[PDB]
């Protein structure tokens, strides 16, 4: 399972961390990754797992590498074709500017109460049941319905669209990754063509009618962009909301704090994004490069885990402790550098709206008795399931 050590890599830097199956997973996924930050582990290591690749383990190095796109390229962002995820500057700036017209802060401010109405109807349908699988019953339906809202798409298309995106990250075997992607494209293409002719004020209409390098955007470019806008906000949001609700279910004192001080909910959102950070992307070396005393070779892959920066004790004191009143919350949960999450403003509103509406309607809830919560590790780390229970008599319809 281990790849043989390339000759340019010294043995003393070898630490065989498996990002898809870390040894301490049962202690919780963030904890399992933080093994990389023990005092005997150098800031830059090589693992022989998953083809062999570098891992930067400290916030300083993670930030620096994400800044230096000239040495650390996005052409190969995964260990071991959406736009703009695979492009370096300067072509990236064009598509990034266009995508920002659909998910940027002004759009998020316009949709805030639509987001709230969606959260309310979901929670209200669960409230009288006294139980749910949060991941399945709230976290999954929420971001897909936000996308249908953004893209002006009908409710009846959800089951099939949801299935297609599920096949890309959690295949049941019906479809290869390529087949799911093309089916997704089969779906988007006619909508794009039609909204070239009769535009609305939706995200597909904007992307379809956009300009890159003097002339109109192609259908190939529009489809691969709309595709990323869809998938970019699903798994991250589903899994992040799950880590957050797991913690709040296990910490009645933190629940109480936000119940008593609702004005702290946006700071709490930021501290949860630090503690339960979940993305680990990477880059490929464009050339030989000596980085902080270490010889990196052209073509080497390097994992730069966005998750690790906020957990670094050099960045935040007592990093495993959740403290909604931290003066300085330092993290790279949405990334850093030219590819910084375009959905970051939408995500923060999704999180804040969720916490406000859930705590308003179902203030007291616990993990279902006897349930053990299981985490999973990957490019986007997550929660397998979150069985929650409450007493309907302690809830309120609002
Ligand atoms: C908690 C939720 C989210 C997290 C943790 C997150 C995290 C990230 C990270 C780390 C990146 C950069 C990856 C890299 O540099 O290789 C990224 C990029 C991106 N995200 Fe998110 N994201 C979230 C929500 C969303 C949402 C809601 C959307 C849209 C609906 C979205 C759309 C995008 C897009 C389009 C990019 C590509 C930016 C570029 O390459 O220029 N994200 N996200």
UniProtKB/Swiss-Prot annotation:
Cofactor needs: heme
Catalyses which reaction(s): 2 reduced [2Fe-2S]-[putidaredoxin] + (1R,4R)-camphor + O2 + 2 H(+) = (1R,4R,5R)-5-hydroxycamphor + 2 oxidized [2Fe-2S]-[putidaredoxin] + H2O
S-S pairs: none
Record keywords, A-Z: Cytoplasm, Heme, Iron, Metal-binding, Monooxygenase, Oxidoreductase
InterPro entries hit by this protein: Cyt_P450, Cyt_P450_B, Cyt_P450_CS, Cyt_P450_sf
Membrane spanning residue stretches: none
Residues reported in the UniProt entry to bind heme: 341
Metabolic or biological pathway: Terpene metabolism; (R)-camphor degradation
Pfam families, per database record: p450
Protein's job: Involved in a camphor oxidation system.
Protein family membership: Belongs to the cytochrome P450 family.
Listed PANTHER family: P450, PUTATIVE (EUROFUNG)-RELATED (PTHR46696:SF6)
Protein name, per record: Camphor 5-monooxygenase
Protein source organism: Pseudomonas putida
